[PDB]
Design a binder for this molecule. Structure first.
Ligand SMILES: CN1CC[C@H](c2c(O)cc(O)c3c(=O)cc(-c4ccccc4Cl)oc23)[C@H](O)C1
Ligand SMILES: CN1CC[C@H](c2c(O)cc(O)c3c(=O)cc(-c4ccccc4Cl)oc23)[C@H](O)C1
Ligand SMILES: *Cc1c(COP(=O)(O)O)cnc(C)c1O
Ligand SMILES: *Cc1c(COP(=O)(O)O)cnc(C)c1O
Lengths: 830, 830
């Protein structure tokens, strides 16, 4: 059937009875009233059973051996579905496929019932998920810590061509994967005030909110390692949240508990955008405060909570603990670690600071200013009074270091301060992170260089040793084996299975680039994937597409910097050219654009409307026929990505040079047989460098060109004046050609393009359409298109998150990865 | 060990492995980190497994045979713990005891970990629970329908002698007994308006709230029948509760979902008191609206949803459905049934009314005015516009019936109206219930008579056939076998086990009233129970009591009508007499008073303080020694009742004659070997009648005496003037003898007693203390005290809820009870 594992005789039999056990005893149903959802659940519980044994021994193992622990703090974990991924990592896929088949059920049908765990916005959250998978596969004692939102990223609906948001009630039917651990609930404090008494400061009169943990297992790839992802949920205490007496109403008090519990209610749906709301700050401290208590508790046990030098010497803390800050969201971990060490453990400031810096590391994800977290001092002042004091003290000591290093450089002083003066004083969380971390890394070579040359230039000059680079990656399990079994199979047929946990081995495929059989196969799986997607499209969304056309797709969050607008200009250009010479042959294309817009991002929502507006015109023009279709992919999310990416021919990665720190969707398309048209931005640079620029479709300005244009001054009118095709498009938009009933509907888009385009869409237009013409030429030559595809696939090995994690491990955490199988799962009950 | 079932070799072995299965796979724990709570859960899941098989076949059975279904609607189900009760009804207690013993665990220790399901205030909620147990034991196709409150009755804490309330987060660690059934979620409507169009009225522009059901199994006593209790939970839809667009904030919209969900958040903590709050009305409609949809859906299937006369003829509705309204709380079921039949099914009014009346029956629980539900018309007008219209129409037609029956009786017309004029117009829910039900019953003979003679005299004259009586009862399983195994054993030793489901057989014990062995035994188990309680007291609450004294207990909700105050007067009298003649012998007593006060009931809270204030003085007077202790039993609830009742010697049932409709605590004490001191009120009358007044300690005014006093006019001063002992007590309270630091602390109590005592505490004082002297005399004669106890126990058979349910079944529902064992639980998987 494929290499989804063995369908053993004893195990298929064992699976079936357990499926039946759960359907009866767990779901309390009988075959005569069970629905597909019930069957999905019976299966999930059956699969979940297989890793608890391993989960228990893995955690017991770490307790015995006591290795250095890695704590990955993130406010986002974009997990997606977990049934298939679990089967894959446990080598259960075929056995399960067989067992459900014999029970008369279609496993694929049941998998579609699982709800996505959408606890993330996009790239940042998905990276955390890929990292968790790699850390387990590399046998690291790692823990993912976050927040268990009861409502994840909103489900996107398109009404009248506009995006409608609706709550993502992903827990509605329950989550079979998590395990509530109410016995490990921890208290988190808010508000209050600081008392300075005799021997130290005291944080007093605080409001208490409880943090209840929920654990989800993270299985490594076929190595019997099962790590833990601990997500915190907010709960109101039953006392004060009722006991603070003297009238108000007993009923009201109880109803008001959903005020403390709102902290973990919903994920902020902003991608690369900072919104300074109090609720967000509460969420950030909540995850940090609870996590750190858990980390220290575990440490106090270790082998120090037995003997060792005897005397809680936190001198060894950094030798046993590593905390990775995914962006600045969990930045309060730095002043919180100090607070605990100084205020509670009573360590001297300098010793505490030494420990803090040595255990914390920070990962920067973007350079755009509106993504930068700058919290108003009055907010921190009211909510976290002691932390503000600690931050001022950290700032004080840091600036003294700067002054000593650059005597008289007064402007440098204000530039590096963690405190920004002005309208309202604010705290720069990025500066906080750099000062309190021993390592700061960018997510792609170009991005890391930009950090040193621009945004954090002063900090790099002060401590060059802190700055590093760790190019992002994606997990080959979910992003190849899981979503593209067909491709994984033909690759395995030639080079074996060892590449699944050693992607570099994909290079061996280079020697099949002229193999007639392989070329035919690679091309066949892509055709099958396209036919499958084309069917899914009519199944769940309904309105046909041609599977013989070039599948041109751009899927990612809607952003001005991502330039979905540039894509739109090209689509309209294609349309206008066909209308000019109807009977001229052009390579048929199905351009698919999908992605969610943050609810308050007006321009992003306007772009979605433009996309659907273009499709309304183009898709119903008889003269165009099936040569051009414009489709907006609704509710783009992890599970949808697993469907479109394997079906794509052309991957659109066209952000303005210097704006996309790295990107990861780009890597997903490369691994799945799509060719890339993009700018020299983020990881694109490293991808072209790995495959050879001749096997990549690069166009547009480079970072330097953008800077040159800025010195000069960007004037869109110029491009409008010199390019007739461009002029024609802008006039079509302006006149209502794409919005008959509301002729001025797109005035904001046009106005922006012409007068305030921070991302110079027009500047890359000419080179973009020219490059697109080259893609079409090559597509007309199936054999050569496929050969270039093989060159990309064979050279994508570097982009596996296993490589990324191995680098973090060695160059930042100080731990050694290992591909050693944990001593089987075997029963055991001590 | 006792007759808690057989500890079979194969089953104890089977139990142990399943306990281990659950500890490993379900709880994901290993013996090295498992805590008593984990062990309790492993056991609960193991026991829960044993009834799913039966649960499934019972429900399948009803589907095949299609008997008339009984729907018991109640806003309260005071269930308590369910582990032990399940073991008892499944005959698993000994096997489980053995198995956990071999696993090295103390089953009794684990049982204490289970949280009470306190979804009720007291009597009314506990009655619903006893009824569910009896209906299952009598093989009735019955369903209990209610609301799944996430917060039940508050946990009571005594601080400084005052009651403090704190949220009852009973779901904190999860509920192993329930099964969420999200697939059966139903929508409930609120607000909106009524459109009268061509062919009928339409309820439009409503706000939708979803009702998600949770099912809990209700096992019958050893007959393999497992019925269902379906509790509804409120959930906000994901659309409109987000989709009603045009600014406000996406985040806010999501947070605002906890506005629709507040409906099932908390139980109103009022016992026999009406609070006209909108949230309460919403709860009442919520349970009614969801339940009725479920009832009709099931009906449409039956055997009509196959063939029969073919044509949804609701003519057979009353032949297949019976809806019992537990008090007026679910009264909206009447106009809701009409709404559905008329507005949706399009039946003519008269046919719909015929069906409604024939399927509905109402149970009245009290005659006190402040418990009467009178909803303001403006509230129903805004929240349920169509129901108000239907109620006016029902009223209209009903009054026309009255006018035709009593021509010219204009005052009768206004008296019987469902609409009350005055300050604000209100709807009398009790009148609604009588008009739309074919049966109305009181809960004890005297209460039922009072209803016909007073409160509902006009209605009784109109339709005498509607009025009935159904004396309350308690289940002998939980209230004897479960809480008093020792007593159940010695009884079984002489007459067998058949009495557990046939309490009348207890009469056979009369022939052992002179048996020397039995007398010694009955007395021994009572002594063991007392020693056990006396230990529990120091264990969990700490401060010693003497197990050799007479255990004088009054446990029930704190009320002015229940007269805990009268008890207080007696206690103070005892104290004053000892202080007067210290060296005179008196029978030692431990008087225990426990019960919760509604949070807003000031007087009730003042009484609790008085009780603790008396104990402060009495318990620390050296001269008193161990002859008199006054203890306030904290957090009285079902699980605590299971502990004190079996340990009691004297049961205090002293409400003012005519105020306690029935009472059930009184029956619990009679069954467990306590003698009763009480007034001729509620069921007390029937209890004395069953045991013989010579074996009961009756005192005080009868209903007639109370009425006589009212004609005359009650003047407390008179009693104050003629009874020195009483005068001395009132002056002690007035002067601060019991509240040194706050001398006027009890001025409200004294003022009330002297000027506005609606319950004439003083009028029964003399006869009360005189009667108490008779109890002490008899206690001094162990042998005779015990012989009187045997006369009470042997004659309590009539008070089993099996008898009550058998009467409801035959005289109201039209179904025949059956003690036939359902065809085993045996595996099966169709
Ligand atoms: C001037 N104004 C433009 C819109 C912007 C804004 C909003 O008002 C609301 C939003 O939800 C977003 C968002 O999600 C991303 C970005 C963003 C992110 C990176 C680069 C450029 C931009 Cl415009 O901007 C947002 C902010 O008010 C400043
Ligand atoms: C005059 N006033 C007295 C208090 C009463 C009241 C409250 O203000 C608040 C409450 O929670 C209760 C309660 O639980 C029971 C009874 C009650 C019930 C039956 C008979 C007599 C009484 Cl007093 O009364 C309550 C109401 O405001 C009328
Ligand atoms: C991989 C992924 C992303 C990130 O895509 P980029 O193109 O790097 O912005 C966003 N959303 C989902 C659903 C993803 O799978
Ligand atoms: C039985 C019971 C009641 C009812 O007691 P009465 O004395 O009839 O008022 C109230 N609360 C609990 C916990 C009960 O078990």
């Amino acid at each position: 059937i494929s290499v989804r594992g063995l369908a053993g005789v004893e195990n298929v039999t064992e699976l079936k009875k357990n499926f039946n056990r759960h359907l009866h005893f767990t779901l309390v149903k009988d075959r005569n009233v069970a629905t597909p959802r019930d069957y999905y659940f019976a299966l999930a519980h059956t699969v979940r059973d297989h890793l608890v044994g391993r989960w228990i021994r893995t955690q017991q193992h770490y307790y015995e051996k006591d290795p250095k622990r890695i704590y990955y703090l993130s406010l986002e974990f974009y997990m997606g579905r977990t049934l298939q991924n679990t089967m894959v990592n446990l080598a259960l896929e075929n056995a399960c496929d067989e067992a459900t088949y014999q029970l008369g059920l279609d496993m694929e049908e049941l998998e579609e019932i699982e709800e996505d765990a959408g606890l993330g916005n996009g790239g940042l959250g998905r990276l955390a998920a890929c990292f968790l998978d790699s850390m387990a596969t590399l046998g690291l004692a790692a823990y993912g810590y976050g927040i268990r939102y009861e409502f994840g990223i909103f489900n996107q609906k398109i009404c009248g061509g506009w995006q409608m948001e609706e709550a993502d009630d992903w827990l509605r039917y329950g989550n079979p994967w998590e395990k509530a651990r109410p016995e490990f609930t921890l208290p988190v404090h808010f508000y209050g005030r600081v008392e300075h008494t005799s021997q130290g400061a005291k944080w007093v009169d605080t409001q208490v909110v409880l943090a209840m943990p929920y654990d989800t297992p993270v299985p490594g790839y076929r190595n019997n390692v099962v790590n833990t992802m601990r997500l915190w949920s907010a709960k109101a205490p039953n006392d004060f949240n009722l006991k603070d007496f003297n009238v108000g109403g007993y009923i009201q008090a109880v109803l008001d508990r959903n005020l403390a519990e709102n902290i973990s209610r919903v994920l902020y749906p902003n991608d690369n955008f900072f919104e300074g709301k109090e609720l967000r700050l509460k969420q950030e401290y909540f995850v940090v405060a609870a996590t750190l208590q858990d980390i220290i508790r575990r440490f106090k046990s270790s082998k120090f909570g037995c003997r060792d030098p005897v005397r809680t010497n936190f001198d060894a803390f950094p030798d046993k603990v590593a905390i990775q800050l995914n962006d600045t969201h969990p930045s309060l971990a730095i002043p919180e670690l100090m607070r605990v060490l100084v205020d509670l453990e009573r360590l001297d400031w300098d010793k505490a600071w030494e420990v803090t810096v040595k255990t914390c590391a920070y990962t920067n994800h973007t350079v755009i200013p509106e993504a930068l977290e700058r919290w108003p001092v009055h907010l921190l002042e009211t909510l976290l009074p002691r932390h503000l004091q600690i931050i001022y003290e950290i700032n004080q000591r840091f600036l003294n270091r700067v002054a000593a290093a650059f005597p008289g450089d007064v402007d440098r002083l204000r530039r590096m301060s963690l405190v920004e003066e002005g309208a309202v004083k604010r705290i720069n969380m990025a500066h906080l992170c750099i000062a309190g971390s021993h390592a700061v890394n960018g997510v792609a070579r170009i991005h890391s260089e930009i950090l040193k040359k621009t945004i954090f230039k002063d900090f790099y000059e002060l401590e060059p040793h802190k700055f590093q680079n760790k190019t992002n990656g994606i997990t080959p399990r979910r992003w190849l084996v899981l979503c593209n079994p067909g491709l994984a199979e033909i690759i395995a047929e030639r080079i074996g299975e060892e590449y699944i946990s050693d992607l570099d081995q994909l290079r061996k495929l280079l020697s099949y680039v002229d193999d007639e059989a392989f070329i035919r196969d690679v091309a066949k799986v892509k055709q099958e994937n396209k036919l499958k997607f084309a069917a899914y499209l009519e199944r769940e969304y309904k309105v046909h597409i041609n599977p013989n056309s070039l599948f041109d797709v751009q899927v990612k969050r809607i952003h001005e910097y991502k330039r979905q607008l540039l894509n739109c200009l090209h689509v309209i250009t294609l349309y206008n050219r066909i209308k000019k010479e109807p009977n001229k042959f052009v390579v048929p294309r199905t351009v698919m654009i999908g992605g969610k817009a943050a609810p308050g991002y007006h321009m992003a929502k306007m772009i979605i409307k433009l996309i659907t507006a273009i499709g309304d015109v183009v898709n119903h023009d008889p003269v165009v026929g099936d040569r051009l279709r414009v489709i907006f992919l609704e509710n783009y999310r992890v599970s949808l990505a697993e469907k479109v990416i394997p079906a794509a021919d052309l991957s659109e990665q066209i952000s303005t040079a210097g704006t996309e720190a790295s990107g990861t969707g780009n890597m997903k398309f490369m691994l799945n047989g799509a060719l890339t048209i993009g700018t020299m931005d983020g990881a694109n640079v490293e991808m072209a460098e790995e495959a050879g620029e001749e096997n990549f479709f690069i166009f547009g300005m480079r970072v330097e060109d953008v800077d040159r244009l800025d010195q000069r001054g960007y004037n869109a009118q110029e491009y409008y004046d010199r390019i007739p095709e461009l002029r024609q498009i802008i006039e079509q938009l302006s006149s209502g050609f794409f919005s008959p009933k509301q002729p001025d509907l797109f005035k904001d888009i046009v106005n922006m393009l012409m007068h305030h385009d921070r991302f110079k869409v027009f500047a890359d237009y000419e080179e973009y359409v020219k490059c697109q013409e080259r893609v079409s030429a090559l597509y007309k030559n199936p054999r050569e298109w496929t050969r270039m595809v093989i060159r990309n696939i064979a050279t994508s090995g570097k982009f596996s998150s296993d490589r990324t994690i191995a680098q973090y491990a060695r160059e930042i955490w100080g731990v050694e990865p290992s591909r050693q199988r944990l001593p089987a799962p075997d029963e055991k009950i001590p």
